[PDB]
Amino acid sequence: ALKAEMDQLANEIDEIGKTTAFGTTKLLAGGFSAGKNFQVGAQDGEDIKVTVKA
Amino acid sequence: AITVNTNVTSLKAQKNLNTSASDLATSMERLSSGLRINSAKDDAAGLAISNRLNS
Structure with a gap:
């Protein structure tokens, strides 16, 4: 009984891992493992990198 | 010139x-x-991004 509940909790951890999105792009699956840049200034090269691992 | 027929101002x-x-x-x-x-x-790209977020 204890282990059956452990398995259900691990399944929900996996579901949250694969389901989280910004619209249609996945966030916790490994697509941001090497970060993405957002240009936060007016000139080229003035930008910040956002990194999320799986 | 002082003209009457055309007024550009x-x-x-x-x-x-x-x-x-x-x-x-x-x-x-x-x-x-x-x-x-x-x-x-x-804003055309924001329109589509917002349609997806709305879905």
Whole structure:
């Protein structure tokens, strides 16, 4: 009984891992493992990198 | 020159007044609606991004 509940909790951890999105792009699956840049200034090269691992 | 048949200052004043009236109408619409993007004239990529976030 204890282990059956452990398995259900691990399944929900996996579901949250694969389901989280910004619209249609996945966030916790490994697509941001090497970060993405957002240009936060007016000139080229003035930008910040956002990194999320799986 | 002192001419009667053509008046260029009036033409330029007309164009400035029209530009101002258009801007005011746009602002009035945006305040009445509560939204920044009322058409694709406004922001086209934001329209699609917001359609997906709405879904």
